[PDB]
Design a protein around this nucleic acid. Structure first.
Ligand SMILES: [Mg+2]
Ligand SMILES: [Mg+2]
Ligand SMILES: [Mg+2]
Ligand SMILES: [Mg+2]
Ligand SMILES: [Zn+2]
Lengths: 129, 78, 64, 206, 102, 150
RNA sequence: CUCUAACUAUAAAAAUCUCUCUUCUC
């Protein structure tokens, strides 16, 4: 084999402040919670594709530091109450992972899907912007 | 008017034996020569900067490259 | 930190931006020409021109 | 060398051996080498031109502009407003003495120095105002090579003018000083200063 | 008068329908007057499909596809240009706009 | 003569909080001087400036007076500052004016001394202010203790 | 009288108005 030290990407992407969070395959001991929100300035870009790329580069450096070589992608959208759709920058995130040395495998979308339960904060007529 | 710049004399206009000493000394050592450049070291008002420039080309002190009106350029005689 | 890169543009991909003063094109790195990136640039160009870029990781979107 | 008989004789120096084109009869385009790859083919030094004045139809087409010799562009930039537009001879003389100064300082046949200043001073990155009203903010963008050389020229001339403005150090001197500082990487040049400032602000609104 | 034969509802003999909620404006909306879509798409943007493929173990991959049934209100949908205002003689054509790409 | 930055070194550190007086605006914002750290110039982009809507630019810029400042990025190789007026809160403003007064008083006393002696004020900070700021953490508190303790 | 596939993302504020109203026949 290639003796790859498998990790998990566990991408957390939303309409605001996408997250990057690598850990063990189970998800026991977390590595580098640092998100894209830890690297951008004006709050324009908490969920920017560039914020995702910066977070991905930092966590790739961290993974090389620790020894993780293969990583498993678990992207996420909030689901439940909010839009069921991935954060905009998360795609760049994964791409920034791919270009940055680390091997990848077993991409998954753990974006929750509910059975039409509870309610979405909003009111009857909906968001009245 | 309010001259907030506060420009001092910024140069002297009447030449002297000692600034003559400097002119004769650092006529070389300045591989670029032009009226503004020679003025810029406190030593000449500028009206007689041309006069000193004429004084320079007397005994093979500095060689010319350009001597145009409003703008003349020398380099130290090698 | 200057991993400077150079990319020859192959095609003009119209023009973006609300002003219409910035045009997006498809530029391929001279190093390993097999890959390309879509990038938006301010100022007239044509294919055959080469552009120096600091960054080599931006696929900028349709600017509005 | 190559002595030629005439009845209406022309000076010997311009009659010597000069199938060896020099701009001001003394500055060849030979061995003036193009540095930047993204800026090659956007500098016209290729054609050996005889003086920094040519009444060419150099604005009719979209991209015939790149066929204009770099010296001509620098001169035309040197023309300032209505007053310097109507006075091309003055600008040509000023740029001639500018190359003279460049030749005086650290030799380095001046044309290479000026083209190196050109390539150094060009901001490859810029900020575009994209946000509509509410989030009125600039965003990152890169810069066309023609746009590169254009702002390089513009920063050079604006620095020369601002430094020269109501200042004893004459415009030819200011321009040559800026060109020397820009052929190197010293922030003393106003042109390179603005180049780095735009690079920084672009690096902010990335 | 009457804007539409179906009153823009498409209930026509159901008495009532359990409401759904818009993805964007998030309004209670009758499930039939609830213009909605299958935003089918591959998990990755079409641009990087190359790079990721050689950035991964397990060659000859499948590249999964993420799905979503998005419920759009009337207002948000007409706002985001995903539904186009039409002439009445043009409105009635219920046929989908003929397979966007081919 | 005012020189010899109140704190230790020339270049501000990372995420250090300072105070800037507006000096000149071209289009991008307040590329101005600092009055707490070194007087080195630093950019202030307009989006890094306003919490409210940008209605009155001229009423807001207020040239000739100090204002809060947070440093985000520093040029430590040629000399420039990325500085902002958006990453501040009121309780942060409190310590901002505290530090403003703390630096102003020491600058006043040592400027008086350097003016009276004609001794280069950088030598004053070298010989006096910096050892006191090393012993006691700040030269102002050291002067206060000097009043009681010789 | 033989075809069933691709795809994206703005919503910043705008408040108001007292006028004259006029006529068609071989
Ligand atoms: Mg509304
Ligand atoms: Mg109606
Ligand atoms: Mg309907
Ligand atoms: Mg109204
Ligand atoms: Zn809606």
């Amino acid at each position: 084999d290639n003796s790859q030290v498998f990790g998990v990407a566990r991408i957390f992407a939303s309409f605001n402040d996408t997250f990057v969070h690598v850990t063990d395959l189970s998800g026991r001991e977390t590595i580098a919670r640092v998100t894209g929100g830890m690297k951008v300035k004006a709050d324009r870009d908490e969920s920017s594709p560039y914020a995702a790329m910066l977070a991905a580069q930092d966590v790739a450096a961290k993974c090389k530091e620790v020894g993780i070589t293969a990583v498993h992608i678990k992207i996420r959208a909030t689901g439940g109450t909010r839009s069921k759709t991935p954060g905009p920058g998360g795609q760049a995130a994964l791409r920034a992972l791919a270009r940055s040395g680390l091997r990848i495998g077993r991409i998954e979308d753990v974006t929750p899907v509910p059975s039409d339960s509870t309610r979405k904060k909003g009111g009857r007529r909906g968001r009245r912007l | 008017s309010k001259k907030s710049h506060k420009d001092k004399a910024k140069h002297a206009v009447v030449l002297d034996q000692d600034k003559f000493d400097r002119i004769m000394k650092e006529a070389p050592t300045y591989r670029y020569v032009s009226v503004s450049v020679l003025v810029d070291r406190f030593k000449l008002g500028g009206s007689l900067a041309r006069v000193a420039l004429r004084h320079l080309e007397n005994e093979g002190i500095i060689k010319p490259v350009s001597k145009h009106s409003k703008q003349a350029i020398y380099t130290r005689a090698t | 930190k200057t991993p400077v890169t150079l990319a020859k543009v192959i095609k003009v991909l119209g023009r973006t931006g609300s002003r219409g003063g910035v045009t997006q094109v498809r530029v391929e790195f001279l190093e390993d020409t097999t890959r390309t990136i879509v990038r938006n640039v301010k100022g007239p160009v044509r294919e055959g021109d080469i552009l120096v870029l600091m960054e080599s990781e931006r696929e900028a979107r349709r600017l509005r | 060398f190559v002595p030629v008989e005439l009845a209406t004789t022309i000076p010997v120096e311009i009659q010597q051996a000069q199938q060896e084109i020099k701009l001001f009869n003394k500055w060849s385009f030979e061995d003036v080498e193009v540095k930047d790859a993204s800026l090659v083919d956007y500098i016209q030094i290729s054609k050996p031109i005889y003086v920094a004045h040519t009444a060419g139809r150099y604005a009719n087409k979209r991209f015939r502009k790149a066929q204009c010799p770099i010296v001509e562009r620098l001169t035309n930039s040197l023309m300032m407003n209505g007053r310097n537009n109507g006075k091309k001879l003055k600008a040509v003389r000023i740029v001639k003495h500018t190359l003279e100064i460049i030749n005086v300082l650290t030799d380095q046949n001046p044309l290479q120095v000026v083209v190196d200043a050109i390539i150094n001073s060009g901001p490859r990155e810029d900020t575009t105002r994209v946000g509509g009203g509410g989030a009125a903010r600039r965003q990152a963008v890169d810069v066309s090579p023609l746009r590169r050389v254009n702002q390089s020229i513009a920063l050079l001339t604006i620095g020369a003018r601002e430094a020269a403005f109501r200042n004893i150090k004459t415009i030819a001197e200011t321009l040559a000083e800026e060109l020397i500082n820009a052929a190197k990487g010293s922030s003393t040049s106003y042109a390179i200063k603005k180049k780095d400032e735009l690079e920084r602000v672009a690096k902010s609104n990335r | 008068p009457k804007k539409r034969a179906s009153n823009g509802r498409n209930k026509k003999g159901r008495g009532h329908v359990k409401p759904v909620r818009c993805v964007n404006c998030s309004r209670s909306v009758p499930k039939d007057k609830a213009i909605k879509r299958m935003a089918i798409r591959n998990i990755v943007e079409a641009a990087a499909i190359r790079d990721l493929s050689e950035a991964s173990v397990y060659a000859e991959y499948a590249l999964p596809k993420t799905y979503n049934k998005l419920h759009y209100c009337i207002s948000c949908a007409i706002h985001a240009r995903i539904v186009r205002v039409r002439s009445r003689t043009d409105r009635r054509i219920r046929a989908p706009p003929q397979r966007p790409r081919f | 003569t005012s020189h010899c930055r109140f704190y230790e070194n020339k270049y501000p550190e990372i995420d250090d909080i300072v105070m800037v007086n507006v000096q000149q605006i071209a289009e991008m914002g307040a590329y101005v001087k600092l009055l707490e750290y070194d007087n080195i110039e630093g950019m202030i982009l307009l989006s890094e400036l306003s919490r409210r809507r940008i209605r009155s630019i001229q009423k807001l810029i207020r040239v000739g007076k100090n204002d809060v400042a947070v440093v985000l990025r520093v040029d430590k190789e040629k000399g420039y500052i990325d500085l902002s007026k958006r990453r501040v809160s009121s309780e942060d403003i409190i310590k901002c004016e505290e530090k403003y007064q703390k630096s102003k008083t020491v600058h006043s006393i040592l400027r008086y001394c350097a003016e009276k002696f004609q001794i280069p004020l950088e030598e004053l900070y070298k010989t006096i202010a910096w050892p006191l700021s090393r012993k006691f953490g700040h030269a102002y508190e050291a002067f206060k203790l000097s009043i009681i303790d010789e």
